[PDB]
């Protein structure tokens, strides 16, 4: 039955709008400056950064880091609320609900971060900002390579033309994974994933019939995510060695057990 999967697909688009205030659509309207309804403040060097706050309400490299760490937590809270709305997620072994979040969360961040990105920068601060890719690359040595990996992935990723209804199910799929180290009841997690996967596959053919082997292409990107996360996890640690100036958030370092 296919009309069962269209229920699950439209259901996860309701949760997605309810759990994530800035969608890809709202972000496209902003990034497509042809919709110059209310443009954002471009931050392209250290001088336009200091002018950022005064206007778009908020060392530079540390200050930008602590910024993306403020949104990181506001994403896990939205992800986590979205995690709860995936059928059967609340009924799972609550010890594995933590394992699902711990390993799956950054992968959703980078997925949805690609929405706010294009070749040149990233929508920041509810879409009121737009920090430049080059400015970020031209940061201090340990940070000149913090966002660039994500910008390279997002360019490959956004070429799939996924929309919010698409992304929703793909988001659920990533969350529900058996691969995660330390899962207890691996069996009931895989049961629901196959539902989402089936739901994903059908949603993709309906909304993108004129691109065959798209459901194919998307899943290869699910493993590309784990490389971003890993490499980012380990580069976040060598900075913890040289930068005792930093105080990383509780929630983030609660999940930042590497490997």
């Amino acid at each position: 039955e296919s009309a069962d999967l269209r229920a699950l697909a439209k259901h996860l688009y309701d949760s997605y709008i309810k759990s994530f205030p800035l969608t890809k659509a709202k972000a496209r309207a902003i990034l497509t400056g042809k919709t110059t309804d209310k443009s954002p403040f471009v931050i392209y060097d250290m001088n336009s950064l200091m002018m950022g706050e005064d206007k778009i309400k908020f060392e530079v490299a540390i200050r930008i880091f602590q910024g993306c760490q403020f949104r990181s937590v506001e994403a896990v809270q939205e992800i986590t609320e979205y995690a709860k709305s995936i059928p059967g997620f609340v009924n799972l072994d609550l010890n594995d609900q933590v394992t699902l979040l711990k390993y799956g969360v950054h992968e959703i961040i980078y997925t949805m971060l690609a929405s706010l990105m294009n070749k040149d920068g990233v929508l920041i601060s509810e879409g009121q900002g737009f920090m430049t890719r080059e400015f970020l690359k031209s940061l201090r040595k340990p940070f000149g390579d913090f966002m660039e990996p994500k910008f390279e992935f997002a360019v490959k990723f956004n070429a799939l033309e996924l929309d919010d209804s698409d992304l929703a199910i793909f988001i659920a799929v990533i969350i529900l994974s058996g691969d995660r180290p330390g899962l207890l009841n691996v069996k009931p997690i895989e049961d629901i994933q196959d539902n989402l996967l089936q739901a994903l596959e059908l949603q993709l053919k309906l909304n993108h019939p004129e691109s065959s082997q798209l459901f194919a292409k998307l899943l290869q990107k699910m493993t590309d995510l784990r490389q971003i996360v890993t490499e980012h996890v380990q580069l976040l640690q060598v900075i913890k060695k040289t930068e005792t100036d930093m105080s990383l958030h509780p929630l983030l370092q609660e999940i930042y057990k590497d490997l």
Partner: peptide, 12 residues
């Protein structure tokens, strides 16, 4: 080890 902050994001 069991991460306390997340469990309070699930209950609520």
């Amino acid at each position: 080890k069991n991460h306390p902050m997340l469990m309070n994001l699930l209950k609520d």
